């Protein structure tokens, strides 16, 4: 995020870090339940990548994070890589996340749900802070 | 990428107004947000765009794409979750 601010640790508990086997953070995701994570189809997740839940500071060896393995990747078959439309993938965990103060689910909207323009929402992540 | 988790507040835009920036690249399963002095950027993809509805945070967008330079004056594009929740529900149920 460019011009964001540091979050209070553990305050966005559904936020996970998608990392490769070397520990490199490449995308975010959200826990929607103990066994499933929603992320973008263009993230190109494979079952060799790791779901890291509970993390705040990626440079700390003393946080109690949860490194979870991925059982199966479900890329929405309507995802259109050319237009980046329907950019959604679901990840089924082989090891269920253990929900706690810092690890919990985000809510899903109803298909009929209304979020008006002008509404102030929040986005989180470990993406670039400057370009 | 920063070591610590960042956050930012940003407003939702209309697809119509989003089109003023992105034109026809803006499809229906997408929602824009930002152009407010903040921007999602490389490495934020796949993470959440949440809106509080009735006191609970709800997933409205999935960080998807936007400006190649993370321009804060251009809106970021998110996968529109209301357009995809049906698919999520079916998958979770069949698996």
């Amino acid at each position: 995020i460019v011009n964001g601010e540091e979050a209070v640790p553990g305050s966005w508990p559904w936020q996970v870090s998608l990392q490769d086997k070397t520990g490199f953070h490449f995308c975010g995701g959200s826990l929607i339940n103990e066994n499933w994570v929603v992320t973008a189809a263009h993230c190109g997740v494979t079952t060799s990548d790791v779901v890291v839940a509970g993390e705040f500071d990626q440079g700390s060896s003393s946080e109690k994070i949860q490194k979870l393995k991925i059982a199966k990747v479900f890329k929405n078959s309507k995802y259109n890589s050319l237009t980046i439309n329907n950019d959604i993938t679901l990840l089924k965990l082989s090891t269920a996340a253990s929900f706690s103060q810092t690890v919990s689910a985000v809510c899903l909207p109803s298909a009929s749900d209304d979020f008006a323009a002008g509404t102030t929402c929040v986005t989180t992540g470990w993406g670039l802070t400057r370009y | 990428t920063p070591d610590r988790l960042q956050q930012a507040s940003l407003p939702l835009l209309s697809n119509t107004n989003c089109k003023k920036y992105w034109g026809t690249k803006i499809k229906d399963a997408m929602i824009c947000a930002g152009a407010s002095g903040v921007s999602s950027c490389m490495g934020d993809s796949g993470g959440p765009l949440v809106c509080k509805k009735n006191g609970a945070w709800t997933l409205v967008g999935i960080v998807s794409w936007g400006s190649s330079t993370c321009s804060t004056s251009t809106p970021g594009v998110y996968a529109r979750v209301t357009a995809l929740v049906n698919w999520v529900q079916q998958t979770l149920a069949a698996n």
Binding site: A7, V8, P9, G10, S11, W12, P13, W14, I32, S100, Q101, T102, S104, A105, V106, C107, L108, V122 | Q7, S9, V50, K52, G55, A56, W57, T58
Partner: peptide, 10 residues
């Protein structure tokens, strides 16, 4: 869901 044990500060 959507109700963090540790409240975000915006």
């Amino acid at each position: 869901c959507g109700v963090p044990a540790i409240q975000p500060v915006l």
